Amino acid sequence: TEALYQVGKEFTSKMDLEKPNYIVPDYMPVVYDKLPQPPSHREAIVNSCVFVHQTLHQANARLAKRGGRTMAITPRHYLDFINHYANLFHEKRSELEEQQMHLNVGLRKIKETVDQVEELRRDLRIKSQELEVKNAAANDKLKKEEYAVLISEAQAIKADLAAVEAKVNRSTALLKSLSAERERWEKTSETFKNQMSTIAGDCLLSAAFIAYAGYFDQQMRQNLFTTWSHHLQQANIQFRTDIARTEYLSNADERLRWQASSLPADDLCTENAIMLKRFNRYPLIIDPSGQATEFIMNEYKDRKITRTSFLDDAFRKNLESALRFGNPLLVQDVESYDPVLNPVLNREVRRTGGRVLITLGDQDIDLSPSFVIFLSTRDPTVEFPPDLCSRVTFVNFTVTRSSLQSQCLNEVLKAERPDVDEKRSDLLKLQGEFQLRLRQLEKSLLQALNEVKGRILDDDTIITTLENLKREAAEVTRKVEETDIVMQEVETVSQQYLPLSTACSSIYFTMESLKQIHFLYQYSLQFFLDIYHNVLYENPNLKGVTDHTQRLSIITKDLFQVAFNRVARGMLHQDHITFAMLLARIKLKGTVGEPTYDAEFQHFLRGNEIVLSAGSTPRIQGLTVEQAEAVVRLSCLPAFKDLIAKVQADEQFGIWLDSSSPEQTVPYLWSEETPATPIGQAIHRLLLIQAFRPDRLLAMAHMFVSTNLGESFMSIMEQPLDLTHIVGTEVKPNTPVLMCSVPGYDASGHVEDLAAEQNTQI
Fold first, then answer.
1. Which residue ranges does UniProt annotate as crossing the membrane?
2. Enclosing H/E stretch for 488
């Protein structure tokens, strides 16, 4: 902690972190034991910088204790952190001061313009007086050749007055047209002090996010930011809580180009793009889906980026060429990392004799300053050694629930409402261009007032340009309003397909969690997307259906069925009920008319955590000790509060307790106010069976799945595998077919027979 503080304080000396008005809180979140008792604002900032680094150690411990994969936290992360803090602070301070410079110039030109028309109106009145004097003098002289010149002079002044009065009206209309811009610039100028007062805190949070948050998923990234934000609050460090981190670390122009480079429209993906732009250590990209690899290649075509791999034979030549010519290089398969990059990643350059040299193996190479290297892997489960973790910036592309919901909502819209989906796509392109144009319009209009000398009225060209920029600004603003209402037509159509997209994300994230119960249950996002595509485009139940609502019900039903069919063929049969149980719970959440049953499922799981004392559990005649305890624990629900009495009042309960199939005749032994639902009755029977006949819990679970998903939902697993249909239609040629068998079983013969049936060579 002492080393971190000294590094932070020494490295932030160039920083302008002096806030004489800073108030020391009564409870100071001190992490450096020798931090001075009345800490200064700079002392608090460096103390907060130390705290952020130590939070990642706590963060790694929490994921490690839960079995999650963690990457080593090294001092190079801290050096990365403070480096980004210095750069962002200077960048944000420079941008704000530069912006405040234009606003002050723009405001003063408008104020001068208001003065100019005031004297020009005074001049207009003066010129009118001159016309009255000249006309009267000419008339009096005429009433008594030179007088023809005098009236010509008066007529010439009349043209001058006409030019003056037209200039007054046009400049007044310009001032009225510039009233909104003058008001907007005044408001921001007042807020200059507030923004200056939060840059120190805002950049600290932003820099920490770039240096540490890359490897973690959406939930863990948010937890880290909230922990840092909370600490700044206890330290009285000022930071704004309104602007999102993506908006504060990137502009709209860059985000527009990122979309053109096929970057997914997702906040975490946008955060990754910012990391891929503001990195200090070279980025290591983790993208199982592969859009990040495409995005990097789209973003760097103009700079001639080359894709290679650590396993390719030309990697050393490609690396040498990229270093020598300064071209971007993308290297895949970083799980096979070649330690030849160790000097490159550590930036161990030797500058002697006007030459910048990098030692690659035993050969010295001149390093061009435009060189950049990106490392990528498609395996999210790969472990890297701590030495590699210290040399790279982790940028993890993990699927978020919101992003998958958007992907699935868009895909069903494309399949089901192609006219609506196309209209949505055109509007997003139109609105993207429209917002782009407005940004140029406000920038250009600001530049015109910031580059004009003397007065605006003096040069009529400046006046015309402002009117044209204002005229185009109003029309585009008119075009934005009309695109807003048409999106409302798109949004209200898309609301019908929202529950399906929620079901899609829940199903995939259930599939993604199946690796926790067996190492074999590995499922990519493409596997689920193939399932989703099958339900939307290769569904025999939609052949003649035309009603959108009925098609949606078919799609929703068939999505659960195909998901179970394809996943369970690659699961052990003992785990089939577990996956079907979860799909039923996902489908239950989709039913608006059903209750949550959260308490009943809370009791169905865990359950044993309700500790019972010796006096808490009595001796119920007709039940064993374990059965009696299950009665007492189940008694905690309001529905089963009168559980012991109901069993005692039922002498026929003894017969049902020792029946072969008690799950099919579970007595109505639960109390309730309103009549329960068939799904609700099954859950009550499920709790009763678990309490009294745990050997029939699987049988009751199958009935629960039958109640939610149908009687034939699990029937495919009972049939022999139809390898012919799956290989011919469901399996892509690039996808290997994995024949996994338990000992004593071997699927080689099935493949050999399958080739014979198809009369194909193998």
1. none
2. helix 460-494
For residues 320 and 322, give the distance between their C-alpha atoms in angstroms, rounded to a whole number.
Answer: 6
* Residue 577 identity (one-letter amino acid): I
Q: To what resolution in angstroms was this structure determined?
A: 2.6
Instruction: Kindly state the DSSP code that residue 677 receives in the 8-state scheme.
Output: P
Q: What is the DSSP letter of 729?
A: I
Q: Which two tokens stand for residue 318?
A: 């490609």
Name the nearest CA neighbour of 210 among 193, 190, 231, 228: 228
CA distance 508 to 491: 24
Q: Which backbone phi and psi does 618 adopt, to 5 degrees?
A: -85, -175
Helix, strand, coil shares of the chain, percent, nearest 5, are 65, 5, 30
Q: What are 105's two structure tokens?
A: 């110039």
- One-letter amino acid of 240: R
Q: List the structure tokens of 619.
A: 């001796």
Whole-number Å distance between alpha carbons of 212 and 73 = 9
Please tell me the distance from the alpha carbon of residue 193 to that of residue 582, in angstroms, as a whole number. 54
- φ/ψ (deg, to 5) at 638: -60, -35
In sequence order, the 6+-apart residues with CB closer than 8 A to the CB of 137 are 150
Residue carrying the six token digits 């990391």: 275
Which uninterrupted H or E stretch holds 501?
helix 498-512
What is the number of other CB atoms lying within 10 angstroms of the CB of residue 99? Answer: 16
Q: Assess contact for 374 and 328: CB atoms under 8 A.
A: yes
Which residue carries 């034991």 as its tokens? Answer: 33
Q: How many CB atoms lie within 10 A of CB 492?
A: 10
Measured CA distances, 608 to 229, 632, 633 (Å): 38, 11, 8
Joined tokens for residue 761: 């060579």
The angle that helices 291-299 and 267-278 make with each other, rounded to 10 degrees, is: 50
Phi and psi torsions of 301, nearest 5°: -65, -45
Using DSSP bridges, classify how beta strands 328-332 and 306-309 pair: parallel, antiparallel or unpaired.
parallel
Please tell me whether residue 140 adopts helix, strand or coil conformation.
helix
DSSP string, 162-230: HHHHHHHHHHHHHHHHTHHHHHHHHHHHHTHHHHHHHHHHHHHHHHHHHHHGGGS-HHHHHHHHHHHHH
Q: For 539, phi and psi rounded to 5 degrees?
A: -105, 115
Q: Measured between alpha carbons, how far is 521 from 513 in angstroms, rounded to an integer? A: 9
Whole-number Å distance between alpha carbons of 89 and 96:
11
* Apex 615 CA angle, 612 and 620, nearest 5: 90
Quick one: how many helices (H) and strands (E) in the chain? 29, 8
Task: Give the count of beta carbons closer than 10 Å to the beta carbon of residue 415.
Answer: 19
According to DSSP, the residues that pair with 375 across neighbouring strands are 284, 331
Alpha-helical (H) ranges within 569-696 are 576-590, 598-604, 625-634, 643-649, 653-657, 678-692
| Separation CA 730–CA 533 (nearest Å) | 11
CA distance 180 to 445: 13
Q: How far apart are CA 711 and CA 662, in angstroms?
A: 19
Q: For residues 265-276, b (16+ Cβ closer than 10 Å) or e, as one string?
A: ebbbbbbbbbbb
CB 49 within 8 A of CB 241: no
* Structure-block tokens of residue 292: 């990040």
Q: Which of 64, 50, 66 is nearest to 8 (CA)?
A: 50
418 Cβ contact partners less than 8 Å away, ≥ 6 residues apart: none
